[PDB]
Write a protein that binds this DNA or RNA. Sequence first.
RNA 1: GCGCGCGCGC
RNA 2: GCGCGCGCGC
Length: 86
Amino acid sequence: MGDVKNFLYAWCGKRKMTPSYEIRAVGNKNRQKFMCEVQVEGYNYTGMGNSTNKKDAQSNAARDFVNYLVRINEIKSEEVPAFGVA
RNA sequence: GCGCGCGCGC
RNA sequence: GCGCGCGCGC
């Protein structure tokens, strides 16, 4: 979803912190790729994302991260609008 | 989104 | 001119 970044952002706003994205350019100058890593304080994991543009490199890293929060039972899937259970 | 400028390719 | 990206001003 577009909104996962916004979700992760809010999620951290509660435990009163910000995520931290770090993007680096990668691959084909003429058809290029970007690499993203997100971290959050107090969490032992780096969400990783690749894409053509930066936004999507970020979305992908965030998805990665949230998915992990769920795996480690810090969120329920059911609480992540993007992971649309319905 | 609209504008501008930049890189790479063709 | 076209394509993929990046950045900047509204």
